[PDB]
Amino acid sequence: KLTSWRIPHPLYTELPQGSKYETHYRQSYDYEDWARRPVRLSKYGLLGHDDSGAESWTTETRSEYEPPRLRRDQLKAAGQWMAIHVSRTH
Amino acid sequence: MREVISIHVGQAGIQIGNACWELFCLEHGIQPDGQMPDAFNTFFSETGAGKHVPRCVFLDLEPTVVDEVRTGTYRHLFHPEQLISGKEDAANNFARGHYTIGKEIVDLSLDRIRKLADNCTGLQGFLMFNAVGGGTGSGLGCLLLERLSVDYGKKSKLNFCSWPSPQVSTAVVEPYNSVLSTHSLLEHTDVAVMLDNEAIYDICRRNLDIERPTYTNLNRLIAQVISSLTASLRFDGALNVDVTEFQTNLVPYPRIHFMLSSYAPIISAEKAYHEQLSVAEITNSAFEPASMMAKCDPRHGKYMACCLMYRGDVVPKDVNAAVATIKTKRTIQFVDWCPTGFKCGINYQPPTVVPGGDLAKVMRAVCMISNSTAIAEVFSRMDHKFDLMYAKRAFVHWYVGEGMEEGEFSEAREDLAALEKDYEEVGI
Amino acid sequence: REDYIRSLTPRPA
Amino acid sequence: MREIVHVQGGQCGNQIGAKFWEVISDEHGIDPTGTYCGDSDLQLERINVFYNEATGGRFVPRAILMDLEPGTMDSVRAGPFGQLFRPDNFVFGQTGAGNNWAKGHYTEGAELIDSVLDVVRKEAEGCDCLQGFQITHSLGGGTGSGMGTLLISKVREEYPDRIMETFSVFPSPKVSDTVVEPYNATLSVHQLVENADEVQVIDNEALYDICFRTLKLTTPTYGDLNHLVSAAMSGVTCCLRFPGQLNSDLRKLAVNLIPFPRLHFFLIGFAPLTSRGSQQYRALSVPELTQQMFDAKNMMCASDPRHGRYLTASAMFRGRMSTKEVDEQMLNVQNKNSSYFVEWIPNNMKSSVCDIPPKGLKMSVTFVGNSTAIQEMFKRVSDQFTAMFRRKAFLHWYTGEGMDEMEFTEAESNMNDLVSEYQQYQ
Amino acid sequence: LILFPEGSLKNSNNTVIPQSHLKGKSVALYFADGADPKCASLLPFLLNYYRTMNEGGANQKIEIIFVSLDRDREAFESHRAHMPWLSIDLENPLTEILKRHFRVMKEYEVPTYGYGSRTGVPSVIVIGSDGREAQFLPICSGLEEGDRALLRWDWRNTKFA
Ligand SMILES: Nc1nc2c(ncn2[C@@H]2O[C@H](COP(=O)(O)OP(=O)(O)OP(=O)(O)O)[C@@H](O)[C@H]2O)c(=O)[nH]1
Ligand SMILES: Nc1nc2c(ncn2[C@@H]2O[C@H](COP(=O)(O)OP(=O)(O)O)[C@@H](O)[C@H]2O)c(=O)[nH]1
Ligand SMILES: [Mg+2]
């Protein structure tokens, strides 16, 4: 297998650097590329537990005390709507 | 709500664990990135943004198969501190687990178990997955099971075991640290399902047609059994059995809780499309004397109680006919004090198929979990193996050096001997 | 060695 | 509205001071070139609490920088978000005051203190709506301890009715560069009890321990140690910047927390604290931030609160939330830790909501709290003080510039008073 | 997308057929060497399996397309005349792009195409509509079951839509 070492003569050209992981687990339980996926962390640094910001802040009075016709439309889009009986019964 | 913790102790617990959690993610359509692209619970905890995280703990004293999960395709899906790996292997030594380095893993494992045993409600069962004949599975399994029986008391625990096989064995100390492992399955376990290697070795080279089953194929077949066990919890079905009726209908006496497993239909895609697979012969092939997942001839003993977890397009009128067929069979015997002994259940989803696995999708499956008198001979082979050991005290210096006291060997002898005495006492 | 699973994210190596 | 005057003093104080102006500028959406970015009404309607407008519209800081070195003045000037600071409020002093309370308080620092009170004056009497001051400094050194408490004193007789609020940095015993911390800090506490009413204790022990444990950090640089401080600084004054449901204030904090007026020393917490590994993996809700705010390590001071008893606490929350869940979380955490609260103060928990979450998060909380475990560090650095004072350790650097030995015993007697008052209220 | 262009698919008698002709069938590529003892041993079994199962029915259920890795065009057609079902012409770059896609290399990734895994010659591979890994037949693989993995074909579930 010395013929495969002719092209990586420094090998630091990144072509063969870290191109294999050759275990039975990867033989048995893999599909297309969901092992080398980068971990999405935060766009604002170490504090930010997820992605959020000024485009999502809406204080309580503004967010719920908006006019009734706008709230009417918004919730119409989300599904707003001894005993005694009628004169039929005996 | 419903949830079961899925403590995976030992290297066999990890390898079985990444196959059962493979199948649970497949049947609920949950990707390794956690996103669905209310049945996710009993196995997954929703984390706000559609991030479903499994409900288990990967537990192994050595950092070689847990780290393999932390670098494989499920390095994301599993929570990082949910996976716990120590520094050294227990060297197939029960004293090295239960009386040595295992303590500094017990504290972290019981901590994370306590985290996810209070994040939701119900807490139906504590599924355990361990290898009895090995090291970290037997030792850290005995510590952590004994601690949960005190702390998280009055909650059922199901110990799926990989018990040593009679002629097949991969370690020469398995006779020692399995008799030294019965004393946790006898006093800290409500249900102990005995799966071994030989009876599932054979079940693949004549039914699955595979002349090279590897351990992954073994881990897929146990994954179908644990799936059909916990299917009646999550998914809506017909007449149903969950973990609490599972104990009140298979455990007649408090210390008789060592029972078998059988799964059908395990037939490949070149093969399963030729037969009926009807409800009569998929339970009759479940009671087939070679089809159990444990090396246990059922005919030198009488059956005691069985549950038949049918799963799929079964109708309750079809099960009563198949029950009648098995009862009229004169090969399967029954004890005289158990007139009715079949507590069946039916779910509505077909069993899920693994793309690339050597199985074809059928619309119904029979997983029987049967308590039998014939399970006594399974433990009796290694009663004879321990007797050849303890005559001249082989392998004792590795045990007594760590933490052993020389008398628990005889205590474990009397624990298995009194266990065998009760199986021949129940069936008279 | 120690927190290898973390230690690429703030500084890759 | 309510003007808040920020002054940062010392090599330590200017480094947290610059990091605090990274954080609140991110909260209010301001570029490092000074102009405003975005369409975010809820971060601009209360811009005057920390900012001033200035001719071309640049939101100029109300920030005052003092340090008797040409040291971190030009590093924060050349650094990011450093072109905000006025090139008038930079008062340098080019001789050095290395590790001496004398060269900050009595000699040297007394000639440049006559110009920094000028900068405090012309900034504050422009609008006579001052709610409080915000002083950042370390007591374990020179300029930060000496000139820092020197401005602390002279600001209080000119405005003897308004808050001054010190985010102090105490000795931090184990990790301690240089050797004169017990002399410098003990001879500086006795002003932080008299002309102070709001003191925030911050150690580098528990700041490192938060890094090593709740973040698991391997190479914690001095930048992100200050990022934890600046997050807690921005959370304790969130209501002066954003509208809320139960509106808090610095004076609402002061009236409600401190007993008898010399007990104003507070632990600080800011606890949505996770790593980036387990950053997607957390149900971020009110019942579990309460579990994280109330367990030892998360407190930024190295005094363990389970060895003492919270006399009065505060749970100043920030985010989208529902209020009976914070109310029942305060009541049950008082119920299980009944021995950790005081029997003659019912309901030892302040609550508030700043509505607008911090940047990046969705909910957070700043736990400022009076503890009678706080004398654990006071007896610790007084023990180091008396161990040096018995043998007359290095003192000629102090008394050579002119101070009496009688002044030092007055410092130790006044600080040993604070040990006794906490004990008899425990 | 179009997996095989309008002139890339050639059967016996050298008549071109398009991808439209390919629907309703179990489509498998056959990566093969002319001089390989492995391929030479496998090929009569593939011939017999193809003939018997395809004669046993009312439909052409399976169909295989041959991808050569021979040294030259003479060896290519000498293998071709032996070989009854479909194939691609050798110097079409579709063969080489299929080599890239399905990762069936022959140790010589390091000269030009330096990725990792090999999965060498021979390879029967049932494929999908847009080039899915439909299922791999274990000839020389982790199961490496020789001349008997053709039974593991799932031809009613792998179909060209
Ligand atoms: N079913 C199944 N059994 C396994 C597997 N791997 C090992 N075993 C069995 O487990 C027994 C030995 O224990 P191991 O699983 O190898 O490891 P362990 O129990 O954690 O003990 P240690 O090796 O000390 O870590 C052997 O008898 C094996 O037959 C597996 O992947 N599947
Ligand atoms: N948390 C924190 N501590 C610091 C910082 N800079 C210095 N220190 C601490 O303060 C001590 C040095 O005091 P220093 O600020 O240089 O004294 P000063 O320059 O006279 O104000 C050292 O022991 C450090 O541990 C910083 O940016 N953050
Ligand atoms: Mg193992």
Side-chain angles (χ1 to χ4, degrees), chain B residues 80-325:
Chain B
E81 293 83 4
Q82 184 178 2
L83 264 60
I84 294 153
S85 68
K87 304 142 291 293
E88 270 67 37
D89 215 325
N92 296 115
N93 189 350
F94 181 71
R96 273 184 67 83
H98 192 273
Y99 291 163
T100 306
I101 62 170
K103 330 281 170 283
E104 66 257 14
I105 295 305
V106 166
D107 187 22
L108 175 59
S109 62
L110 287 182
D111 196 2
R112 196 35 70 83
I113 278 165
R114 187 239 64 73
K115 303 303 289 167
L116 60 85
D118 284 350
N119 55 2
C120 202
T121 195
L123 277 300
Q124 271 76 356
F126 279 34
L127 292 168
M128 200 77 108
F129 292 84
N130 66 335
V132 176
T136 73
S138 82
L140 183 63
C142 183
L143 270 175
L144 185 142
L145 195 69
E146 184 161 51
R147 292 296 310 108
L148 297 162
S149 58
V150 167
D151 189 19
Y152 277 120
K154 296 183 290 294
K155 295 212 151 283
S156 63
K157 293 175 282 292
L158 321 187
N159 291 60
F160 271 42
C161 286
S162 197
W163 184 292
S165 301
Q167 292 94 19
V168 172
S169 173
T170 78
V172 310
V173 303
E174 300 184 1
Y176 268 110
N177 56 10
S178 284
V179 185
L180 262 67
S181 187
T182 61
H183 76 273
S184 51
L185 288 151
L186 183 138
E187 71 205 37
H188 304 303
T189 303
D190 297 345
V191 165
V193 192
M194 291 315 78
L195 274 80
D196 52 58
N197 288 314
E198 281 190 358
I200 319 179
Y201 279 171
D202 308 336
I203 209 75
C204 298
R205 67 178 183 268
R206 70 181 186 271
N207 297 111
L208 278 78
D209 208 9
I210 59 171
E211 51 82 14
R212 276 185 281 272
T214 191
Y215 276 164
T216 72
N217 294 77
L218 271 290
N219 294 348
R220 297 167 190 287
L221 263 71
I222 184 174
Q224 307 275 337
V225 173
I226 192 66
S227 178
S228 66
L229 182 62
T230 64
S232 178
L233 274 78
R234 30 187 154 86
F235 293 101
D236 217 324
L239 73 164
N240 49 17
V241 54
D242 82 8
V243 72
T244 61
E245 290 88 5
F246 183 76
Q247 174 268 339
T248 56
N249 286 287
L250 288 179
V251 188
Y253 290 156
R255 304 181 52 277
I256 295 285
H257 45 273
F258 287 107
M259 73 291 291
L260 301 103
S261 175
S262 292
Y263 193 78
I266 53 171
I267 297 89
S268 66
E270 55 94 15
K271 202 43 150 162
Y273 284 58
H274 273 171
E275 300 88 5
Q276 293 323 339
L277 283 72
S278 86
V279 285
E281 69 270 14
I282 54 174
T283 181
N284 197 359
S285 74
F287 279 98
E288 200 258 334
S291 69
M292 283 73 74
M293 323 206 80
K295 266 294 183 182
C296 172
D297 170 57
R299 294 161 285 177
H300 62 87
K302 299 207 296 285
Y303 276 55
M304 186 180 288
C306 315
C307 65
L308 271 68
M309 294 96 87
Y310 293 172
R311 160 177 191 200
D313 199 73
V314 189
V315 164
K317 270 316 166 184
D318 291 331
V319 64
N320 285 120
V323 171
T325 307

Side-chain angles (χ1 to χ4, degrees), chain D residues 82-154:
Chain D
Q83 293 323 339
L84 265 69
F85 301 108
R86 317 187 39 80
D88 314 299
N89 286 40
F90 291 118
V91 295
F92 313 150
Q94 309 100 334
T95 187
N99 322 297
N100 206 334
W101 188 66
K103 286 183 180 179
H105 197 268
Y106 285 156
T107 188
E108 202 294 338
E111 62 87 21
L112 187 56
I113 203 73
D114 282 274
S115 83
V116 75
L117 276 296
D118 302 342
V119 176
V120 171
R121 276 197 209 80
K122 65 201 81 83
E123 191 271 338
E125 50 85 28
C127 57
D128 56 6
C129 52
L130 188 153
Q131 204 270 332
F133 291 90
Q134 188 169 306
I135 302 299
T136 80
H137 60 275
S138 58
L139 282 72
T143 69
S145 168
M147 183 177 176
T149 191
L150 183 62
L151 179 48
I152 277 169
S153 62
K154 324 182 81 53

Side-chain angles (χ1 to χ4, degrees), chain E residues 9 14 21 23 39 74 76 78 82 91 93-94 96 98 107 112-113 115 126 133 144 149 161:
Chain E
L9 212 53
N14 279 8
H21 282 52
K23 294 142 180 63
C39 182
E74 294 79 58
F76 174 44
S78 75
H82 182 254
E91 71 295 329
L94 186 134
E96 162 46 69
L98 260 52
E107 291 77 320
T112 305
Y113 305 107
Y115 194 62
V126 65
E133 183 32 66
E144 69 274 15

Side-chain angles (χ1 to χ4, degrees), chain B residues 51 76-81 115, chain D residues 216 275 277-278 280-282 291:
Chain B
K51 167 37 72 181
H76 287 95
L77 177 72
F78 291 118
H79 197 302
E81 293 83 4
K115 303 303 289 167
Chain D
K216 275 87 71 179
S275 65
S278 310
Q280 313 263 10
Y281 304 170
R282 184 177 201 80
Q291 174 271 359

Side-chain angles (χ1 to χ4, degrees), chain B residues 328-392:
Chain B
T328 49
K329 281 287 163 44
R330 284 291 51 61
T331 57
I332 297 89
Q333 293 179 356
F334 281 88
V335 286
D336 61 349
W337 52 268
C338 187
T340 182
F342 284 157
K343 294 302 151 73
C344 56
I346 299 165
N347 214 346
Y348 284 121
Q349 70 275 16
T352 183
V353 73
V354 164
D358 59 358
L359 289 170
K361 50 191 206 61
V362 299
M363 72 290 291
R364 61 213 80 181
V366 177
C367 175
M368 90 178 192
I369 299 297
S370 300
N371 190 359
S372 84
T373 309
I375 205 59
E377 191 275 331
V378 167
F379 303 170
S380 175
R381 314 174 294 209
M382 282 72 74
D383 287 330
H384 199 68
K385 290 188 180 181
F386 201 102
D387 289 331
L388 295 174
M389 281 315 128
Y390 200 67
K392 63 179 70 65

Side-chain angles (χ1 to χ4, degrees), chain E residues 45-60:
Chain E
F45 292 92
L46 193 48
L47 281 154
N48 174 265
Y49 184 90
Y50 182 76
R51 156 173 269 193
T52 61
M53 182 178 72
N54 185 87
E55 271 314 329
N59 282 6
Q60 179 184 9

